[PDB]
Design a protein that fits this description.
Elements (H helix, E strand, L loop, with lengths): L2 E7 L3 H12 L8 E7 L6 H7 L5 E5 L5 H12 L4 E4 L15 H5 L4 E9 L13 E5 L7 H4 L8 E4 L1 H4 L11 H12 L4 E12 L3 H20 L5 H6 L2 H14 L8 H12 L7 H12 L1
Parallel strand pairs: 1-2, 1-4, 2-3, 5-8
Antiparallel strand pairs: 4-7, 5-6, 5-7
Helix pairs in contact: 8-10, 10-12, 11-12
Bound molecules: uridine-5'-diphosphate-glucose, ligand RAB and magnesium ion.
The ligand Nc1ncnc2c1ncn2[C@@H]1O[C@H](CO)[C@@H](O)[C@@H]1O binds next to helix 8.
PDB class: transferase
Keywords: glycosyltransferase, transferase
Assembly: monomeric
């Protein structure tokens, strides 16, 4: 009724158990909450789901074919009855404040809250987020249009007004950055009021020919998405120009068989945020920082 948790899942029955248990330890009245698990035509997870359902109002949906996270999430958005929807990937965990920390902002007039993200390089549980080897923390406020440049959060961090009621769904033609496209669909396409909640955190758990072709899917979907959704300030429209620069440097390294920094994208976001801010750096300066971020 109040909140629908949507968990797309695929061949990770055991991570899905951790995510569900992190819903069960929510500091929240469970009579107001439903959970929708969507098996994207992988190994069955009935016994995993029938276990948690002894406490949560849980629904298991079985896809007719492997549809990608877009098609699986959409299946959840279609039946989610909550005024509000909270996405949770099957390999991530909520903190117990995930809803008590976001719902007051939504009831107050927000349409879309994202919380802080801890990039967890060790597996954790919901009540033990702050016992993990935290590699990076994504905590960028919404004051600069960073989200217009490229994505800086993840669906496990998002609680938002019923997208089925807005008629806003995931694009099934995108297997990567389908979330970036969806966030802009809500914020621009449907004028959702985006608000950052920095007092709540999730734990997000995260070959050359292999790598070059992989990042190329990302750049090409990033161009697609940029073209579909123009930036809502001129500075952000200018700072998009440094993304193909960052890609070119990534490709250069990959071709020389040199590895990039572990979280070079997340170091890149910090450079792009800087470039969007009060004293504006010259492009040669950003370029030098994109270097360090990637080295
Ligand atoms: O065919 C698939 C693959 C995955 N999933 C589920 O989708 C979620 C995300 O999959 P995962 O492999 O964990 O994604 P990440 O690599 O962590 O992130 C991807 O999905 C993110 C949102 O989770 C986007 O931010 C990024 O573009 C993209 O890299 C999880 O619930 C998966 O179980 C499906 O339902 N179907
Ligand atoms: N604009 C973009 N948005 C999201 N991801 C992007 C991206 N450009 C590349 N990537 C690639 O996807 C992974 C990011 O964590 C990593 O594989 C790599 O950084
Ligand atoms: Mg993941």
């Amino acid at each position: 009724m109040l909140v629908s948790v949507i968990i797309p899942t695929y061949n990770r029955p055991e991570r899905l158990a951790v995510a569900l248990q992190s819903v069960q330890t929510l500091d929240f009245d469970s009579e107001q909450l439903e959970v929708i698990v969507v098996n994207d035509h992988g190994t069955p997870v009935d016994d995993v789901v029938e276990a948690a359902g002894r406490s949560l109002n849980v629904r298991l949906i079985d896809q007719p074919s492997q549809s990608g996270p877009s098609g699986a999430r959409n299946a959840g958005l279609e039946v989610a009855r909550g005024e509000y929807v909270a996405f949770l990937d099957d390999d991530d965990v909520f903190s117990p404040q995930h809803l008590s920390g976001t719902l007051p902002l939504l009831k107050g007039g927000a349409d879309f809250v994202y919380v802080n993200i801890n990039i967890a390089r060790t597996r954790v549980t919901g009540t033990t987020i702050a016992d993990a080897e935290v590699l990076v923390r994504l905590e960028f406020p919404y004051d600069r249009g960073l989200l217009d440049v490229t994505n800086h959060f993840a669906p496990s961090a998002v609680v938002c007004r019923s997208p089925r009621s807005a008629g806003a769904f995931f694009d099934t033609a995108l297997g990567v950055e389908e979330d970036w496209d969806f966030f802009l669909r809500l914020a621009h396409g449907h004028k959702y009021r985006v608000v950052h909640q920095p007092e709540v955190a999730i734990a997000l758990h995260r070959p050359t020919s292999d790598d070059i072709a992989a990042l190329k899917v990302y750049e090409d979907n990033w161009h697609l998405i940029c073209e579909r959704w123009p930036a809502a300030t001129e500075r952000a429209e200018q700072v998009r120009r440094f993304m193909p620069v960052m890609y070119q440097m990534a490709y250069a390294s990959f071709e020389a068989g040199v590895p990039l920094d572990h979280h070079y994208y997340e170091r890149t976001l910090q450079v792009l945020y800087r470039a969007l801010g009060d004293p504006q750096p010259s492009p040669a300066q950003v370029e030098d920082e994109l270097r360090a971020a990637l080295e």
